[model samples]
Target: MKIGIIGAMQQEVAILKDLIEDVQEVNQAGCTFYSGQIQGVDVVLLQSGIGKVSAALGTALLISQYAPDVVINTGSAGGFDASLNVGDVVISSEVRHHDADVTAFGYEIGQMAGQPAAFKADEKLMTVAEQALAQLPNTHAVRGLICTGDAFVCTAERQQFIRQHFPSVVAVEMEASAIAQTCHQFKVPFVVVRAISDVADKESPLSFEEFLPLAAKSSSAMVLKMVELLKENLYFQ
Candidate 1:
């Protein structure tokens, strides 16, 4: 199956893009897509810009243009679960938008007006992800809920607001849920695999700066390894 992978920053996509051989690239909708082979597996890599709109537009383009069989949103996130660390991997079982509140209309906290409260990760793709993680001895990963919002959750109040409502969120980031939502609309199976770059309250501006590269490396490693494994078993086979 051809894989579509999205990352929101240079640090997140650089390593994955470099893994592609015989690469062909093009730009559209303000995003650059690199399509090629990774260990004989067809792959399309997109560096979607930060935030929800950027992710949605890029995903819509990737799905309709590149038309990958499956999509993966891979990158760095702020850890909301106490179990997570600066370099830990958190794969989404489901993703939602923490900032999309339609409470007055009686929707769930993060649920869009007409959309489901959360977007689900494909079960079979997640199975392959676990298989891939096992092959990488030093990497650590867990599967759980990942929440998205335009704001970087750096303050206790913001953190409290999210947790009081959805206590299950283990990862918080800018783009994954938007990616998930778009993929859901297109009926393409998807998964979110991310590394924790900072704790929501790790606080100082420099803290995220301090850990981003480390987190990016861990996440990129997971993506490539998953790609490698996907070569043996077609996601549906």
Candidate 2:
């Protein structure tokens, strides 16, 4: 199957360029998309910059250009669930824009005016990720909700407010929901895997800085393994 991967930062996707075979680069909109084969499957990788608009545009570009069978988003996120620690992985079962507010118009918080309140991950992809993560060590993976917004979540007050409203949110990040939303509209399967860098708190920035590389590497590695397993037909089995 043809697959597309989107990372919000260079650190999140840089490793894959070296891991793929027969790589070719296509530059568009200030983003370089690396087209290659991974585990014998056609795959394209690109950095989508950061935030909702960038991610949405990148998703559209990828779908229009590559027409991939599936899109995978891998990166680091700030943990909201206290049970999670640095290096833990989150497979997004659901995603929503935490900053959206149309409640006064009778829409739920985080729900856009006409869009669904939440976008769900592809079930088969989620199974593939969970299976791949099971074979890894020194980290744990859980299927949960991920909330996305443009603002960096780094304060206890903001974190608590998010939790108060979206009680199911497990991770906070900048890009996944927009990608999920776009993929949903395009009828392409999608999945997002995030490695915890920090629990959004006063010291989150420091912790995120310290764990950024490791978290990115962890999430990227999981994505590669998932692709490898997909090539092996493990998902169908």
Candidate 3:
């Protein structure tokens, strides 16, 4: 199956992009897409830039132009679960727009006008991520909720607010849900594989910016491994 991979920052995507051989570059939608093969599997990788809007634009552009069978977003996020630590990976079972609130209209929290409260990860791709993460070392992987928004969550108050709303949330990031929403509209399967760069309480001595590289490497490595597994699978042809 052809796959599209997105990372919102350079640190999140650079390592994986470097491994793409015989790549073809396309600059559009304020980002760069590198199309090539990895592990004998056709793939397109993009550094979609940060924030939800940019990610959505990039994803829409990816679907309209390149048309991959599935899209995978790999990046770094802040851990919301108490059991998680920096460098731990969180695979999206579903993703929510943590910043969206239109409850007065009787819509669910994080639900846009006509959209679901959460965008669920594609089951097959989620399984692929589980298998891919298993072979990687030093990082624990959990499949669960990933809440997303524009703000960089760092305080105790905001943590309580989001947890009060969505108790099942495991990780918080800025871009994955936007990509998922776009993929949902485009009828392309999608999933998020992100490493924890900081804990919810911000207890880590190193800031998100400081610890991002290690998280990026772990997430990027898992993504690369998933392509290798996909190449040998019978799931999608």
Q: What digit string (tens of lDDT, one per residue) describes model 2 on residues 1-237? A: 788999988888877777889999888897778998987888999788999999999999999989988889999999987788888888999899999999999999999988999999999999888888888876687779999999899987899889999998899999999999999889898999889998888889999889988888889889999888887884532
Candidate 1 lDDT over 1-237, as tens digits, reads 789999999889999899999999988878989999999988999999999999999999999988899998988999988878889999999999999989999998999998999999999888988988898878878799999999988888999999988899898999998999999899999999999888888472567898989888999888888887788776553
Model 1, C-alpha of 110: deviation from truth (Å): 0.6
Which candidate, 1 or 3, would have the higher TM-score against the true structure? 1
The per-prediction CA RMSD against the true structure, in angstroms, equals: 1.2, 1.6, 1.4
The segments of candidate 2 whose C-alpha lies over 4 angstroms from its true place after superposition are 234-237
**Regions more than 4 Å wrong, model 1:** 202-204
Structural similarity to truth (TM-score) of each candidate: 0.97, 0.96, 0.96
- Taken over the whole model, the C-alpha lDDT of each candidate is 0.90, 0.88, 0.88
* Shift in Å, residue 123, candidate 1: 0.2
Instruction: Residues 99-169, candidate 3: write the lDDT tens digits.
Output: 99899899998888789888999899999998887788666988899999998888889888999999999
Residue 101, model 1: lDDT of 84
Top TM-score: which candidate number? 1
Model 2 poorest ten-residue lDDT run: 228-237
**Model 3 reaches what TM-score against the true structure?**
0.96
The residue pairs that clash in candidate 2, if any, are none
